[PDB]
Design a protein around this ligand. Sequence first.
Ligand SMILES: [Pt+4]
Ligand SMILES: [Pt+4]
Ligand SMILES: [Pt+4]
Ligand SMILES: [Pt+4]
Ligand SMILES: [Pt+4]
Length: 129
Amino acid sequence: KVFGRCELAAAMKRHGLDNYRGYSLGNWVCAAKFESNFNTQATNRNTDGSTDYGILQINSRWWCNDGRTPGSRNLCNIPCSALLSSDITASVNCAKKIVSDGNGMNAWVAWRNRCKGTDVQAWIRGCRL
Ligand SMILES: [Pt+4]
Ligand SMILES: [Pt+4]
Ligand SMILES: [Pt+4]
Ligand SMILES: [Pt+4]
Ligand SMILES: [Pt+4]
């Protein structure tokens, strides 16, 4: 599913991401925009053989099992395919574990490079929440 900006903001808010570990909603919507362009079905292969999955491009080296990343850790305890669903619940629950891991949202390279220190509130502007 390809989410609209405000539709995704609303779903993320409902799933408890607004101010989760201090990160306002706009940060999460910005990260999703540049990681996956709001497409739950996005996949991207990394040079190390791991793959990133879904709206927040969660990586198979640590977070999920895809059956093809030797020495992967499956920390969210979830097949990576579950992260591609039109229901964002699995992605959100896994992202909560990731952002709690000590590096905050710096775990998402597009967030560091494209969202961090920008006016992220613009991403929720005009939305009914
Ligand atoms: Pt569809
Ligand atoms: Pt709502
Ligand atoms: Pt939902
Ligand atoms: Pt909804
Ligand atoms: Pt594996």
